[PDB]
């Protein structure tokens, strides 16, 4: 017994996705970046399906559904990598078959970006982040993505309120020792925003340099305004 929204988000959680880096291809920054962008493309399909499970998300206009996903997609991807990484030390679990350490981060040109993701990991390890809290924060990051393009501002605010309420009710029942735990969880969202912004900018620059092939969906979310 905690909160039905939390229960519902847990059963909506997508299945594990394999990176499947091409074993015939020599190891290189281009291979690593190709593997990551391919993995992101596939995860984005599953993120779109998952969003439809979030109560009220479907009742927004298609424009408003697109705007929230265009602003939040990379925060959702990053929160996944952070959650998969909590039991690891200085490694990022992009996928069960794609665990990046510091050297692989240097070789891929991702040392600054992966260091920032590890800063999110460190904070969530010290807070002992629970799956329930992770799925609820992923939903809040979607609802709270601060798109410039929102048509129904009140509806988007009501989706924020519903999810925030779910987090607060979860924390009130599960963590009576810390009555400010919900707030402390919200206080982690600035770092996710910062990290997501840097990731989008880094991958947009790789897109511009033209050396890494990228699929249609990944490209469409990189090109969003």
């Amino acid at each position: 017994p905690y909160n039905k929204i939390v229960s519902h988000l847990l059963v909506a959680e997508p299945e594990k996705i394999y990176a499947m880096p091409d074993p015939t291809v020599p190891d290189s920054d281009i291979k690593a970046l190709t593997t990551l962008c391919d993995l992101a493309d596939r995860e984005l399909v599953v993120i779109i399906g998952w969003a439809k499970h979030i109560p009220g998300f479907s009742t927004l206009s298609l424009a408003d559904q697109m705007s929230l996903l265009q602003s939040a997609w990379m925060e959702i991807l990053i929160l996944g990598v952070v959650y998969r990484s909590l039991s690891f030390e200085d490694e990022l679990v992009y996928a069960d078959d794609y665990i990046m350490d510091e050297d692989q981060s240097k070789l891929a040109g991702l040392l600054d970006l992966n260091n920032a993701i590890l800063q999110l990991v460190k904070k969530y390890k010290s807070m002992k982040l629970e799956k329930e809290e992770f799925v609820t924060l992923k939903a809040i990051a979607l609802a709270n993505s601060d798109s410039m393009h929102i048509e129904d501002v009140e509806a988007v605010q009501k989706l924020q309120d519903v999810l925030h309420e779910a987090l607060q009710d979860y924390e009130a029942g599960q963590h009576m020792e810390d009555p400010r735990r919900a707030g402390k969880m919200l206080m982690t969202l600035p770092l996710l925003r910062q990290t997501s912004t840097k990731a989008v900018q880094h991958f947009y620059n790789i897109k511009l340099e033209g050396k890494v092939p990228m699929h249609k969906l990944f490209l469409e979310m990189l090109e969003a305004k």
Binding site: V45, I48, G49, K52, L62, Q65, M66, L69, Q70, K216, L217, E220, M221
Partner: peptide, 12 residues
């Protein structure tokens, strides 16, 4: 318009 994001949001 012909957006893959839109098409995926509209389907199933």
């Amino acid at each position: 318009n012909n957006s893959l994001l839109l098409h995926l949001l509209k389907s199933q």
